[PDB]
Scaffold this motif. Structure first.
Motif, PDB file in Angstrom:
ATOM      1  N   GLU A  13      -3.129   5.228  10.744  1.00 13.05           N
ATOM      2  CA  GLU A  13      -4.563   5.662  10.480  1.00 13.05           C
ATOM      3  C   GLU A  13      -5.262   4.381   9.755  1.00 13.05           C
ATOM      4  OE1 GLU A  13      -6.131   6.728   7.176  1.00 13.05           O
ATOM      5  OE2 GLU A  13      -4.801   5.673   6.161  1.00 13.05           O
ATOM      6  N   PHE A  14      -4.670   3.452   9.432  1.00 14.23           N
ATOM      7  CA  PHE A  14      -5.498   2.396   8.309  1.00 14.23           C
ATOM      8  C   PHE A  14      -5.271   0.953   9.015  1.00 14.23           C
ATOM      9  CE2 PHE A  14      -4.458  -0.796   4.728  1.00 14.23           C
ATOM     10  CZ  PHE A  14      -5.749  -0.699   4.049  1.00 14.23           C
ATOM     11  N   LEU A  15      -4.031   0.542   9.326  1.00 18.00           N
ATOM     12  CA  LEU A  15      -3.922  -0.959   9.936  1.00 18.00           C
ATOM     13  C   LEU A  15      -3.779  -0.726  11.463  1.00 18.00           C
ATOM     14  CD1 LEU A  15      -1.293  -2.315   7.402  1.00 18.00           C
ATOM     15  CD2 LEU A  15      -3.865  -2.726   7.383  1.00 18.00           C
ATOM     16  N   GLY A  16      -4.192   0.419  12.023  1.00 21.25           N
ATOM     17  CA  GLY A  16      -3.610   0.473  13.493  1.00 21.25           C
ATOM     18  C   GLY A  16      -4.589  -0.508  14.171  1.00 21.25           C
ATOM     19  N   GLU A  17      -6.113  -0.440  14.060  1.00 18.89           N
ATOM     20  CA  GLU A  17      -7.024  -1.197  15.072  1.00 18.89           C
ATOM     21  C   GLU A  17      -6.607  -2.689  14.833  1.00 18.89           C
ATOM     22  OE1 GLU A  17      -8.233   0.679  18.138  1.00 18.89           O
ATOM     23  OE2 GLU A  17      -8.543   1.744  16.151  1.00 18.89           O
TER      24      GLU A  17
ATOM     25  N   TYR B 230       0.859  -1.225  -0.042  1.00 17.26           N
ATOM     26  CA  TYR B 230      -0.126   0.205  -0.139  1.00 17.26           C
ATOM     27  C   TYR B 230       0.725   1.308   0.097  1.00 17.26           C
ATOM     28  CZ  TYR B 230      -3.903  -3.115   1.162  1.00 17.26           C
ATOM     29  OH  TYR B 230      -4.831  -4.204   1.293  1.00 17.26           O
ATOM     30  N   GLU B 231       2.184   1.224   0.129  1.00 15.53           N
ATOM     31  CA  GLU B 231       3.140   2.252   0.222  1.00 15.53           C
ATOM     32  C   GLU B 231       3.515   2.747  -1.313  1.00 15.53           C
ATOM     33  OE1 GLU B 231       3.940   3.206   3.292  1.00 15.53           O
ATOM     34  OE2 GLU B 231       4.755   5.147   2.579  1.00 15.53           O
ATOM     35  N   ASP B 232       3.217   4.209  -1.410  1.00 13.73           N
ATOM     36  CA  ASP B 232       3.762   4.893  -2.575  1.00 13.73           C
ATOM     37  C   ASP B 232       5.362   4.888  -2.633  1.00 13.73           C
ATOM     38  OD1 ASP B 232       3.902   5.965  -5.086  1.00 13.73           O
ATOM     39  OD2 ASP B 232       3.525   8.085  -4.118  1.00 13.73           O
ATOM     40  N   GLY B 233       5.936   3.897  -2.249  1.00 13.04           N
ATOM     41  CA  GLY B 233       7.327   3.755  -2.230  1.00 13.04           C
ATOM     42  C   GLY B 233       7.784   2.422  -1.816  1.00 13.04           C
TER      43      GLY B 233
ATOM     44  N   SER C 219       6.435  -5.932   5.225  1.00  8.91           N
ATOM     45  CA  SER C 219       5.531  -5.804   4.356  1.00  8.91           C
ATOM     46  C   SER C 219       4.365  -6.434   4.570  1.00  8.91           C
ATOM     47  CB  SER C 219       5.992  -6.430   2.974  1.00  8.91           C
ATOM     48  OG  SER C 219       5.086  -6.131   1.875  1.00  8.91           O
ATOM     49  N   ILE C 220       4.571  -7.775   5.164  1.00 10.33           N
ATOM     50  CA  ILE C 220       3.344  -8.626   5.561  1.00 10.33           C
ATOM     51  C   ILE C 220       2.440  -8.162   6.670  1.00 10.33           C
ATOM     52  CG2 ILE C 220       2.730 -10.849   6.571  1.00 10.33           C
ATOM     53  CD1 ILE C 220       5.177 -12.058   4.826  1.00 10.33           C
ATOM     54  N   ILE C 221       3.074  -7.805   7.766  1.00  8.92           N
ATOM     55  CA  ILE C 221       2.548  -7.064   8.944  1.00  8.92           C
ATOM     56  C   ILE C 221       1.856  -5.874   8.683  1.00  8.92           C
ATOM     57  CG2 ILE C 221       4.125  -8.253  10.417  1.00  8.92           C
ATOM     58  CD1 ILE C 221       5.315  -5.393  11.021  1.00  8.92           C
ATOM     59  N   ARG C 222       2.358  -5.036   7.450  1.00  8.27           N
ATOM     60  CA  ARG C 222       1.654  -3.781   6.978  1.00  8.27           C
ATOM     61  C   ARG C 222       0.903  -4.237   5.716  1.00  8.27           C
ATOM     62  NH1 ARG C 222       6.787   0.408   6.625  1.00  8.27           N
ATOM     63  NH2 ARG C 222       7.737  -1.324   5.778  1.00  8.27           N
ATOM     64  N   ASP C 223       0.481  -5.506   5.778  1.00 15.89           N
ATOM     65  CA  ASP C 223      -0.620  -5.789   4.888  1.00 15.89           C
ATOM     66  C   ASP C 223      -1.870  -6.144   5.416  1.00 15.89           C
ATOM     67  OD1 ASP C 223      -1.996  -6.732   2.361  1.00 15.89           O
ATOM     68  OD2 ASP C 223      -0.826  -8.550   2.153  1.00 15.89           O
ATOM     69  N   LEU C 224      -2.996  -5.558   4.950  1.00 12.81           N
ATOM     70  CA  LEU C 224      -4.342  -5.873   5.367  1.00 12.81           C
ATOM     71  C   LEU C 224      -4.822  -7.313   5.252  1.00 12.81           C
ATOM     72  CD1 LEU C 224      -7.576  -5.102   6.198  1.00 12.81           C
ATOM     73  CD2 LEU C 224      -7.604  -4.564   3.753  1.00 12.81           C
ATOM     74  N   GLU C 225      -4.399  -7.820   4.369  1.00  9.31           N
ATOM     75  CA  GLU C 225      -4.880  -9.255   4.141  1.00  9.31           C
ATOM     76  C   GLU C 225      -4.534 -10.381   5.158  1.00  9.31           C
ATOM     77  OE1 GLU C 225      -3.964 -10.704   0.177  1.00  9.31           O
ATOM     78  OE2 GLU C 225      -4.798 -12.556   0.446  1.00  9.31           O
ATOM     79  N   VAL C 226      -3.286  -9.949   5.676  1.00  7.18           N
ATOM     80  CA  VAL C 226      -2.981 -10.910   6.836  1.00  7.18           C
ATOM     81  C   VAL C 226      -3.655 -10.958   7.965  1.00  7.18           C
ATOM     82  CG1 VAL C 226      -1.217  -9.387   7.948  1.00  7.18           C
ATOM     83  CG2 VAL C 226      -0.546 -11.796   7.996  1.00  7.18           C
ATOM     84  N   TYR C 227      -4.303  -9.738   8.315  1.00  8.23           N
ATOM     85  CA  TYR C 227      -5.097  -9.729   9.371  1.00  8.23           C
ATOM     86  C   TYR C 227      -6.502  -9.856   9.210  1.00  8.23           C
ATOM     87  CZ  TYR C 227      -1.075  -6.798  10.937  1.00  8.23           C
ATOM     88  OH  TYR C 227       0.030  -6.285  11.255  1.00  8.23           O
ATOM     89  N   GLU C 228      -7.004 -10.155   7.812  1.00  6.04           N
ATOM     90  CA  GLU C 228      -8.250 -10.961   7.411  1.00  6.04           C
ATOM     91  C   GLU C 228      -7.955 -12.257   7.345  1.00  6.04           C
ATOM     92  OE1 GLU C 228      -9.208  -9.333   3.615  1.00  6.04           O
ATOM     93  OE2 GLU C 228     -10.303  -7.405   4.589  1.00  6.04           O
ATOM     94  N   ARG C 229      -6.831 -12.924   7.058  1.00  9.83           N
ATOM     95  CA  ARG C 229      -6.783 -14.400   7.163  1.00  9.83           C
ATOM     96  C   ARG C 229      -6.377 -15.074   8.291  1.00  9.83           C
ATOM     97  NH1 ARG C 229      -4.659 -14.976   0.939  1.00  9.83           N
ATOM     98  NH2 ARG C 229      -4.676 -17.144   1.116  1.00  9.83           N
TER      99      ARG C 229
END
Ligand code: FAD
Length: 257
Positions: free
Chosen positions: A164-168, A60-63, A124-134
């Motif tokens: 602000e996005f993956l915090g909770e 999700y990072e622009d970088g 990268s994984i802990i900063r991926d939304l999918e890992v917390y959905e699965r």
């Protein structure tokens, strides 16, 4: 060249005399999955000098971001350690790796076991939304020799839960377990020695490894990988692949040359 992307370094942070991380630009067409690596390096005498590097930045990072070792007589990292802002680096456009969720069977826990620069693909994984959905729980284990080698340890602890996005989800689903071997720290010993004694499960508050709940991703030193692979395989856990999902996948953080 031309099979590579020309990216511009935007930030450099040196953790120790052997560890440093730097961020670059990300090509609009560069796409990857969390846990993959690419060929990263420099343009030397009109020829590419590249080494395998896990993408430490979120998809999700622009970088981009790379958690890099510093070897004094190493062909790449001896020139790469002296990077400055605005410097040009080349990234291959074809990601590849075994640290994918699809190479694992659906599970309750994801155990990210890493040492040294093996933390890179899991950043990268802990900063991926999918890992917390699965996965209900993501356990990020990082093993180092000195306390100063614990890179990103304030980011994962203090700043990632405030995302602000993956915090909770990081607050609820991420467990961060750093360990140090050769310096006084709140967690001592190898991550393998903490598995045998069971101190790993007592500290993180989760039951022992079972074939139904726990999935693992291993990315560290060859002596940690071969030691944890024997530990996992003797309890019944099988290695997953693209063709056959399993319980744990493995990637080398480096090779001994
Ligand atoms: C799949 C894969 C993913 C990798 N991901 C990363 C990554 O995210 N970050 C990273 O820094 N390297 C990573 N590496 C290692 C990568 O090859 C190194 O960048 C490279 O070996 C060191 O650069 P060099 O050419 O200057 O040193 P080399 O001449 O390649 O090797 C220098 C010496 O240092 C050792 N070494 C190399 N890399 C490391 C390391 N990371 N930690 C400890 N010792 C090391 C080598 O075994 C060798 O003895 C990865 C390797 C593979 C195969």
């Amino acid at each position: 060249s031309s099979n590579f992307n020309q990216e511009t370094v935007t930030d450099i942070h040196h953790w120790t005399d052997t560890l440093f991380s730097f961020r670059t630009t990300r090509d609009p067409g560069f796409r990857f999955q969390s846990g993959q690596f690419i060929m990263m390096g420099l343009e030397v005498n009109g020829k590419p000098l590249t080494r395998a590097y896990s993408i430490a930045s979120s998809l999700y990072e622009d970088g981009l971001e790379f958690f890099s070792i510093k070897v004094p007589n190493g062909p790449l990292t001896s020139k790469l350690q002296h990077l400055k802002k605005g410097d040009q680096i080349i990234v291959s456009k074809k990601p590849v790796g075994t640290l994918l969720y699809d190479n694992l069977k659906p599970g309750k826990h994801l155990w990210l076991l890493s040492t040294g620069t093996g933390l890179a693909p899991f950043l990268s994984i802990i900063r991926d939304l999918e890992v917390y959905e699965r996965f209900e729980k993501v356990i990020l284990v990082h093993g180092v020799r000195q306390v100063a080698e614990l890179a990103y340890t304030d980011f994962i602890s203090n700043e990632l839960p405030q995302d602000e996005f993956l915090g909770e989800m990081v607050k609820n689903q991420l467990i961060y377990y750093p360990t140090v071997t050769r310096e006084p720290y709140k967690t001592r010993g190898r991550l393998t020695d903490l598995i045998r004694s069971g101190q790993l499960f007592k500290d993180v508050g989760l039951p022992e490894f079972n074939h139904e709940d726990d999935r693992m991703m291993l990315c560290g030193s060859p002596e940690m990988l071969a030691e944890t692979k024997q530990i996992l395989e003797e309890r019944g856990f099988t290695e997953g692949s693209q063709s056959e999902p399993g319980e744990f996948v493995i990637e080398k953080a480096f090779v001994e040359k």
